[PDB]
Amino acid sequence: LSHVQQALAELAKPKDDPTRKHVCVQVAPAVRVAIAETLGLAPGATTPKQLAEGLRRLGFDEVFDTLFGADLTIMEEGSELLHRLTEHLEAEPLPMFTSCCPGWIAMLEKSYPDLIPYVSSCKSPQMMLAAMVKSYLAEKKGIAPKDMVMVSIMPCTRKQSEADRDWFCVDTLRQLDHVITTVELGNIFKERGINLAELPEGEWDNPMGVGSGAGVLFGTTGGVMEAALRTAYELFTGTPLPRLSLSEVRGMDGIKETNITMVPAPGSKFEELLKHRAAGPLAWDGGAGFTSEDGRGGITLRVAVANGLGNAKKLITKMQAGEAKYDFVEIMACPAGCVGGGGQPRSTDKAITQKRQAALYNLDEKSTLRRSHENPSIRELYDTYLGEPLGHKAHELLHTHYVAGGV
Numbered sequence: 001l002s003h004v005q006q007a008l009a010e011l012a013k014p015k016d017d018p019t020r021k022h023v024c025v026q027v028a029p030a031v032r033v034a035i036a037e038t039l040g041l042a043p044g045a046t047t048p049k050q051l052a053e054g055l056r057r058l059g060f061d062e063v064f065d066t067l068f069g070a071d072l073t074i075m076e077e078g079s080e081l082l083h084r085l086t087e088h089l090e091a092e093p094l095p096m097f098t099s100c101c102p103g104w105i106a107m108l109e110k111s112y113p114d115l116i117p118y119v120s121s122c123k124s125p126q127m128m129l130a131a132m133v134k135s136y137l138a139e140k141k142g143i144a145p146k147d148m149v150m151v152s153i154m155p156c157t158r159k160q161s162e163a164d165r166d167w168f169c170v171d172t173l174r175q176l177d178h179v180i181t182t183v184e185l186g187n188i189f190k191e192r193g194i195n196l197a198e199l200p201e202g203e204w205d206n207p208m209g210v211g212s213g214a215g216v217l218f219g220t221t222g223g224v225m226e227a228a229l230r231t232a233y234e235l236f237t238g239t240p241l242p243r244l245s246l247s248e249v250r251g252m253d254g255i256k257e258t259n260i261t262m263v264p265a266p267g268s269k270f271e272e273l274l275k276h277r278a279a280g281p282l283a284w285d286g287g288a289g290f291t292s293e294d295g296r297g298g299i300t301l302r303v304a305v306a307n308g309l310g311n312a313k314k315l316i317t318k319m320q321a322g323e324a325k326y327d328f329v330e331i332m333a334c335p336a337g338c339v340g341g342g343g344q345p346r347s348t349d350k351a352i353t354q355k356r357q358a359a360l361y362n363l364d365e366k367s368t369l370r371r372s373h374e375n376p377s378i379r380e381l382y383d384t385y386l387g388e389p390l391g392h393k394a395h396e397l398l399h400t401h402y403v404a405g406g407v
């Protein structure tokens with residue numbers, strides 16, 4: 001039985017069936033924008049809440065937004081980056097690589113096992129949300145994890161392999177049981193005569209198990225990498241980080257970069273560290289610093305983004321050669337990123353991924369910058385359950401490790 005079949009079988013049990021499990025779903029933004037295409041419509045032609053209604057009609061007990069999981073990843077990865085920076089300023093190495101793309105993680109383990117220590121220990125948004133629901137939410141609702149099935153809808157054909165990593169288990173209890181792609185889900189709806197464009201607005205569930213809505217605030221973060229950078233930057237400097245604009249790197253396909261200059265906040269420990277101490281296949285060059293005549297030092301964070309895997313191999317070679325100098329690097333296996341993932345609908349439109357990206361968020365939400373640490377649902381989870389980012393409980397549920405040679 002395929003994972004689609006297993007999931008549908010669980011949903012086929014009447015809710016009052018004594019062998020019926022609690023079945024929940026989480027949905028990626030890239031799925032939400034592309035699912036309209038499965039009906040021959042434009043990206044974003046169906047609303048987030050129409051999709052939530054559609055999923056509920058399949059028999060899902062809870063319907064979650066993967067963006068809640070991404071708030072968790074931003075919390076942990078922003079903290080991890082800042083921690084690595086602090087340790088390096090006072091003399092888990094740098095540069096740091098993101099860890100959300102399983103295509104990258106597979107290549108890392110098989111082809112670059114020596115780079116393992118440089119990779120973020122964070123789990124992906126979907127795996128963080130799944131770990132959370134089978135632990136925190138299970139406890140809150142008085143439901144045994146064994147009686148819980150979680151499904152995720154992803155634009156990606158590699159997300160099941162991510163979910164299947166052996167140790168992503170609960171206390172064979174899987175944190176995330178089944179991954180379904182955008183097109184597979186689109187097919188499920190069409191086969192059941194569900195037309196998403198004709199559905200009423202439904203509603204999301206909060207993974208916290210109380211209140212209404214998806215448990216994510218209004219607005220956009222700019223994505224996990226930018227938001228992790230913002231978390232670190234704003235704590236370091238005491239000043240806001242605007243939306244980033246990445247620029248194409250000359251002579252290297254699929255690579256974009258930005259340099260972020262950071263002056264420590266006055267009176268901060270960061271200011272102290274820079275002053276008090278002025279003096280590995282990828283050796284950190286001690287970082288790119290700057291100073292002024294009066295002694296106001298700063299560091300420039302050198303950030304790169306690679307799409308996709310061939311292009312990433314060429315970046316790594318340059319990095320190892322010392323020809324490319326970066327402090328924080330995001331590698332995505334797909335040329336267009338997740339909106340162009342292998343589980344997405346096929347279009348004759350060469351610019352379909354541009355249309356999908358543009359429709360990801362409305363102009364209203366686009367104009368409002370969201371910060372994960374300000375989300376009351378996230379605050380409550382840390383305050384009452386997780387403890388501190390990077391802490392013992394957070395590490396146990398939300399972090400992971402890598403296996404040289406692969407799994």
Ligand code: SF4
Pocket residue numbers: 100101102103104155156157158159332333334337338339340341342
């Ligand atoms: S970039 Fe592609 S392979 Fe990587 S997580 Fe996104 S959809 Fe999956």
Ligand SMILES: [Cl-]
Pocket residue numbers: 100124125126127
């Ligand atoms: Cl994810």
